[PDB]
Amino acid sequence: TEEFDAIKIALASPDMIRSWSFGEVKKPETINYRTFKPERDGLFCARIFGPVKDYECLCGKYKRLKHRGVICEKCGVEVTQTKVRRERMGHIELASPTAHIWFLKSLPSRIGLLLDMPLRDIERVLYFESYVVIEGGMTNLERQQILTEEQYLDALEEFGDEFDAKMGAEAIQALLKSMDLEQECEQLREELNETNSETKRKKLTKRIKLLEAFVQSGNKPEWMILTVLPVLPPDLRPLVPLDGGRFATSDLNDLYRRVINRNNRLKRLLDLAAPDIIVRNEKRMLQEAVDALLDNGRRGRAITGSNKRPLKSLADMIKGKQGRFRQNLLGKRVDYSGRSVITVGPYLRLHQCGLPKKMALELFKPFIYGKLELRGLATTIKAAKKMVEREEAVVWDILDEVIREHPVLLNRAPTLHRLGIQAFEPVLIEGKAIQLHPLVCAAYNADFDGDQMAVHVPLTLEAQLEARALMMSTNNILSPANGEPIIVPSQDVVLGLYYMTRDCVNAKGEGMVLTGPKEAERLYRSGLASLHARVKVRITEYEKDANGELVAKTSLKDTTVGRAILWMIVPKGLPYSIVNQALGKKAISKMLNTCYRILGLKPTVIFADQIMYTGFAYAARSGASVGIDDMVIPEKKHEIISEAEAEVAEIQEQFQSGLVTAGERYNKVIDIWAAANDRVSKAMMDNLQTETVINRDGQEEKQVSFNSIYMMADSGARGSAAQIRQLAGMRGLMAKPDGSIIETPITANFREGLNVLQYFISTHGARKGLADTALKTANSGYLTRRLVDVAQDLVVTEDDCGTHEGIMMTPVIEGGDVKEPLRDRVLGRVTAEDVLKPGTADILVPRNTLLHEQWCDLLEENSVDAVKVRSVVSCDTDFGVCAHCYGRDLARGHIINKGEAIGVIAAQSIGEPGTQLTMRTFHIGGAASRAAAESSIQVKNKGSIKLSNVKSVVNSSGKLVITSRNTELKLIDEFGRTKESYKVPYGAVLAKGDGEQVAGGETVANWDPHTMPVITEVSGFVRFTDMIDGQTITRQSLVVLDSAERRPALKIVDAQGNDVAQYFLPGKAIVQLEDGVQISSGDTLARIPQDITGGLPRVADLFEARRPKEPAILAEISGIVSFGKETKGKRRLVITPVDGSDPYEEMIPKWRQLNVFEGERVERGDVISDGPEAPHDILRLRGVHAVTRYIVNEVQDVYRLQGVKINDKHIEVIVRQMLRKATIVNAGSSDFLEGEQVEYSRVKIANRELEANGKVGATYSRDLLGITKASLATESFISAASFQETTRVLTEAAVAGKRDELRGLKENVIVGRLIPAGTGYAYHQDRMRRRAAG
Amino acid sequence: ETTQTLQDYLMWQVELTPFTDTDRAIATSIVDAVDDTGYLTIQIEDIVDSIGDDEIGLEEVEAVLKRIQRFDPVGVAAKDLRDCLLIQLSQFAKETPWLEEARLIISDHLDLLANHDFRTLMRVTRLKEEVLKEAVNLIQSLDXXXXXXXXXXXXXXXXXXXXXXXXXXXXXXXXXXXSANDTLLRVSRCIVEQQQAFFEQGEEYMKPMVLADIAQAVEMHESTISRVTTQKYLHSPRGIXXXXXXXXXXXXXXXXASSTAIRALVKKLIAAENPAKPLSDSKLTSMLSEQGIMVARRTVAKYRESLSIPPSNQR
Amino acid sequence: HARSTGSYSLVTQQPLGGKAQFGGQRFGEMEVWALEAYGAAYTLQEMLTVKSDDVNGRTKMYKNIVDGNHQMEPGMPESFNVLLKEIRSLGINIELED
Amino acid sequence: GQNMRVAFMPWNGYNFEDSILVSERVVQEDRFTTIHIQELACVSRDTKLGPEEITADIPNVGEAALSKLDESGIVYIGAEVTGGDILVGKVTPKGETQL
Amino acid sequence: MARVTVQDAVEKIGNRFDLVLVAARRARQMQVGGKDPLVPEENDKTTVIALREIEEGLINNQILDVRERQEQQEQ
């Protein structure tokens, strides 16, 4: 009846069952069917559960229930709780303590294991014959042994007296009763130290943790077998859906009366002193009876019934549907929603929606009843209804005051993000359709084809404020996953503003002065053109330059009529130059952007509304149409075609000569028709000029054409030049579901009819393109469920925890041109420690601050290449995030508050992008097919280059090559920031020597994949080796040896007269020279060469942390690696040397490439490459930071291909959610070598350093995995399995006794309560202080 | 349609009309006495004594019960059936062609003798011509008054069982409808076909049937024969009534019908009889003895007067 | 369709499945994820229980709307207690602590 | 279908995305007005309490609802039925109510 | 008086969660009864009147606490 903070599950006791409820039934007499009155004893009847109806009973006393806690005659008096039927249950009393079926063992099955003995033995002695010997001693036998009927007869014969053996579990209750848990646990630890067997480790840990769970739980293990058995309320049993339900036909009811019958038989036979086999058969068949009660099985098939019901009884029937399901979880009905078709209209300011009057009357019907009964016209509620269906004109006058300020919720069937649902103020409209505000086609993502829409009405009271605060659309102008302004104008608005601001030359009137300018009045008076001329006008302009003040001025400026008319809409002080240019969708989005940044929210929402109004107004009076004369046919295109085939007929002729194959001819044809497509495209762009022009002569381009196609494609409103290339000019190439492009493209366009072969081949592309949408949409919507499934448990807790260590933020860019600067990465968040200027002792920030446009401009005008930034992970805070590092609070701004839910926007934000990429990873190779000629490594922009991760190799030529595995190139922007950063191919041949730098030109590398450096750095003949068969069969000047099937490296020869450095193993090598042949430095000795992130199925591998095919080994501190040093006779490339203790050794089975040829003693963090790196070896060696930037930078590199932006915050939150469940290296208080929680480890370390003891708990190893094992690692058992079996979860929580502690989401959702997220969370705090007040 | 009915809906209507404390308590004490007819409040003294004194007089509960009688299905509870009729007349129209007054005269008293016939009462109410007949038409247009619940959308069809067909002047079973199941149904379709052959409905009633004959035919156990025909109902071309053609007697006479034609034809002979009100059981027993049925007149009078028969109260 | 309050069903005490017969549409866990994304609390509370699966909550809430109280009368109705009983049938216990 | 005069121009935002505007004269001219036909069927059965009859009397129904029903309980051809009205009734028996 | 943006009223004590609960418990007094508004009524519902009282600064958590102490002391 009060708030539920948390509970631990404990094992109930017979005294606890006698405590809770009370009842006595000695007879299976329920109800006489010719009476229908309460009867004596019995179950399923009104004899227990207090009164049968309301509060009353038929006894002859205690009918008013003035006393409680006893039974009267045929009706239970005790209530002591509440309600009527569902109240206190009652129980039955078994003579011999028995049953449970799945008590000790959960299959498995901790009990029957903790005691220490096989499960087959206990399962065998509970049933059938075999007995357990107890009260042993004085002989060699022990109580742990088991006996059989033959061993029982011979046992009582030989051992004689003091021998006790029982059929039931009473012998188990005494044997378990004589057990001492503390001394047993001590012996299990003493045996845990001595025994090194791995199989013994897990058993001892399980037994110890069990026994401890019994120590702190306070539950007696003997309570597992219950004497008193309670019964459930009969009406809570769901009846069979087929035909009608009956409580007497209940599947468990027959089993209940069956257990009552076997109980009466047991009492009669025990009181009758029946033979032993009889009463013991009664005990065993009673055990089978309760076996039938709880389960349908584990004893075999116990099912009974009239139709032989399958048994989804107590085992499977808890909360129905094999688990906790029915509450929440999809298909419950909404109760006061509606649905209709949406229609657009040019009104209803951003918060409102058109609501049909027929739909509004029924939804607000109860408010109609209330206000009709209130305002004084009414008699009864049924006559008020009569007035409702008679629909007087006064009823709608009531409804007008009903709706008013009480908005309503809108819902689509899909919701891909938070903003998918919004609330709006209803406005009564005539029609059968609902009207929605035009400005947002984005958040709903659906245009109007006639789609159907849902409308939900919350009422409560505070649901109104909750609707007008965190929901109404005017409150959120930004997207939670970006921060870029949504609700950008489009469609008619862009065309109207483009036609409005446009400039004209040489029209009627000009050369005049207008103030204000007052020109708009004339525009309606004609005698002028809105796009005609630029005329000196005096404009007044405000500004914020004075702090807290507005500095004005009025100047004479040149502009066009439409622009100065639009200047009236500018809200008090935006700069004038923003409307002084032709306005496209770009300048519109920048206009609303700068308006929202400068002037805030309330000015820019009404500003956007008015820009909408004038947009559809002047777009309405624009009067633009399409036509056959608007589309022009290029006159040079007929030549471009004739020039194309004249070339093709030549190339095809080469096929007749046999000098050109089909591949070369193919590529040449594709290049010819591609260049022809470019040429006809340029001819189209030059043709669209000078078509519909204003009256004028001469000049050059004559006021660039006003035709609709150039305004649509050029203005960016709806179309674009890409489809204009298909409308005018050629059609280009086509897509066949093959992978080879046809050699006869379509040379015509939609101006003329297409041949049956052109339209016939043109269908294959669409046919191959129609089936992708739903197929990819399936998984695209499937990933979100798993992302929410892992990410739902994180919530906001503290204000500022504070810390020092954090993530170092440095700008990173993709290959070629610059992608993102340091601005967007450092924007917002928190800056740890200090960031110095390029001069010493000068700090930019005193300690830390939330970075906004001003501080970002301070970082822009100054030089800082490294910004220390805080984040999740680090600055770890107990039970959630500190709510400081997470700041910048996307789609809002402030220092981030408390109570929000984290991971729900992080999940939907990552899974919200639809479909997939354009190409699949690097495997398709669409940018470049194989290698044309060379990789072409050179720089472009000015500034010096710096070679990163290079190792010099002596060459005879002035240029020096590099044998390093990974190589980078740095360029100078201003202070040395990265401009062009590209990955240099492994072992690239540099045309520019090392130690030399140049800015621009002079290509510094040449790379072809026929080679890879192995060269003698000194002149003289090749090192002498032995040539033997079996090593010459390797696959890519005779080859000598190969280290794979065993290029083995040997001491370099430093002289031509004497035979006398280190070479890494690529894994595949062919010797290109012969021993004893003169070779010189810089000349080829042996040269020959031997996951892939991106794509959504690969993204699932990024979060799920799949193991790659070829792993990448990493190197630790010390060690010696040169040329397979310390390598054993077998399994080459194993590192022996001690080198400062730390016996670091790695086992490589000789078929894999070598780490490095140099460096000698190495350290932790050195990259030996050897393929794609696994996150486990990175987390184990590099740290958590390299895993964070690993996953984050890879996923970002995946999403950057489509241009979509996702901030690093959410991905970092997922990485933090994947850092759970880390293991400790050394023993803690009491434990060894197992898994644990990072939170509990941190708390136990706080208790380690808190008071006295030097070491309690020790260092740990961080574990990762993800998305699967981390989701099943939840410590709360109520939310542990919404999927897995319920029995094992309730067994672990029952024996362990773990608290609920209620931190999470699905906890308080599934169990139900006000959720500890958002406003309700504050409620949860608002009570605690009250609880702290007394 | 799986909807709440009776004191659930009625009590839900009681909760709407605001009742502070006592009106709600005595209200809930009234609503439980409603029956399927709805106008039976039984004894008011039981509702008063069930309160257990402590004031709450009869005058306070009278207005509460009157408020219960004003609910949605017009007349509710009250007593004597002469009350709810007044409420039906009060809320009906309130503007009528002199129907209100005469409605209060007829509904007030004298309605007991006016239901069978008017006659001399036509001079008592002073009405004449079509005014009295139209008033009686209004009384016939009024209403059981309640019984608006139920909402019985579905009927639970018998769906037959086994079937028969009449050939050339003979009726034979067929067991038409829809290996151990085929033979298991072939046994019932067999013994049922022979039972339909020995028993013909024929003309007028049915031939007497004795379970010993059907049990002697196939040597089947009569317990299993009559046990299946009790639950299941054999559906023939006419009628529904399978166990009725199984259980009978030996009629205790050599010149004869069984209890089926004894009680059936007994009520048929009592159907046309008593030119005014003879109500003579001994005469019907003599008529049964004239046919040779050997009636002791003790069983014919008691068994014939049962099963909806007006006898012997028809006297 | 635009229903308001129609007839209900005996099983789970939920309104009928589809329109014309007056269906109660659908409310999914994805919209639950939306309201939880807003941090919405009382709206989620009313949509899940009182307005959907609560039986007597329709009578109390309805009387609050007719009289103009507009109060939820907070607490945990229905399924919590039924869960206490279905779990209580098993030999393990549930309590209430602060 | 039916061809009509079509104009190409954005007008006051009334055509937005895929939407369309039409005139009132189109509605006045009956153009593309649609007709539909439905079917309702009643069934009579023989229950365990005996056969079912049809109408000729109904309890708990006023005369205004039965005024549109012809003798035998069938509606007049051409009559206008709106909403929850009644077409062809029927009756199922009960018993032991005469005590 | 319609409220287009609630941010101006949230700026008083920034939460954006607390305005719903504080303005809700403030709306309970005028909603149910036994209280009078401190702002002249526009005939609009008390739902917006709550936000307008929060915007005028006359009502907050501390003010409702002091008024609660006054009601407990007067009783």
Next chain:
DNA sequence: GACGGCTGGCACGACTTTTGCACTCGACTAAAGGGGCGCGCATGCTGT
């Protein structure tokens, strides 16, 4: 106004019918108990 005859209602006895035990009685499901196949691995004889 008292009494005997007539008749209806009711309790009891006899007839008939049908239910728990008591021992059946021969043509399936698919889930579980056993066995063979194959694979992994540990031991040891041996050639280097």
Next chain:
DNA sequence: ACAGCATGCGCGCCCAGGGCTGATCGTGCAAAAGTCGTGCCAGCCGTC
């Protein structure tokens, strides 16, 4: 004295095979229950 390969053994997994339950199905019967007959007693009436 150390390393390789052949052999033998233990165990996991899949396939095949038998055996209780299931599907019925039977119903004999002594007795218990339902129903009908039947005699008895009390209530109602007519005329002496």
